[PDB]
């Protein structure tokens, strides 16, 4: 089985919620110019300081950004998958990246029908590298618990 699922409206709303929104470019904590819903590239080109966009543009850029992540989750899933399970897996993959999702325990458990196990293993992805050392991010712990709620219970953030 290969996926042809799409991110739902509720799934896009959840990724928006996790990213936050700025209409003026800002330099993130790592020094990368960022705009909209966590966008760092627009139509293949970097975000630039001083740029201002509309909320409509921000949604357009986020839709373009998430497309390859939707594709990758479709290709990684080997079993029938509910819309909320798909939304959660795309949200998490959008944060951890394609390679991390592909080789993850959570995707193995999803493909074995072990939903509870998948929700547990999803939440292992809470570390960030700081000064060459892996540090637990409280922000990521929060995002992981909200993505597990989408995956298991179809309960989306507000």
Numbering used by the authors: -3 to 154
Please give sentences taken from the publication describing this entry.
To better understand the mechanism by which LysF1 functions, we crystallized LysF1 and solved the structure to a maximum resolution of 1.71 Å. The structure contains two protein molecules in the asymmetric unit each comprising the full endolysin sequence derived from FAHEc1 (residues 1–154) and two phosphates. The completed model reveals that the overall architecture of LysF1 consists of three regions, a catalytic loop region (Glu15–Lys41), a connector helix (α2, Ala51–Lys71) and a C-terminal α-helix bundle (α3–α7, Gln79–Asp149). The protein exhibits a cleft between the catalytic loop region and the α-helix bundle where peptidoglycan is proposed to bind. The catalytic loop region contains a β-hairpin (β1–β2), a structural element that is conserved across the glycoside hydrolase lysozyme super family and contains predicted catalytic residues Asp24 and Thr30. A putative catalytic residue Glu15 is positioned at the C-terminal end of α1 facing into the cleft. The catalytic residues of LysF1 are positioned 8.9 Å apart, consistent with T4L-like endolysins, which would accommodate the peptidoglycan and water molecule between the side chains for catalysis. Therefore, the catalytic site of LysF1 is consistent with a peptidoglycan hydrolase that inverts the anomeric center of the peptidoglycan glycoside during catalysis. Inspection of the LysF1 crystal structure revealed the unusual appearance of a charged side chain (from Glu88) positioned within the hydrophobic core of the α-helix bundle. Wild type LysF1 had a melting temperature of 53.6 °C. Glu88Leu was the most stabilizing mutation, increasing the melting temperature by 9.4 °C. The methionine and phenylalanine mutations increased stability by 7.1 °C and 4.0 °C, respectively.
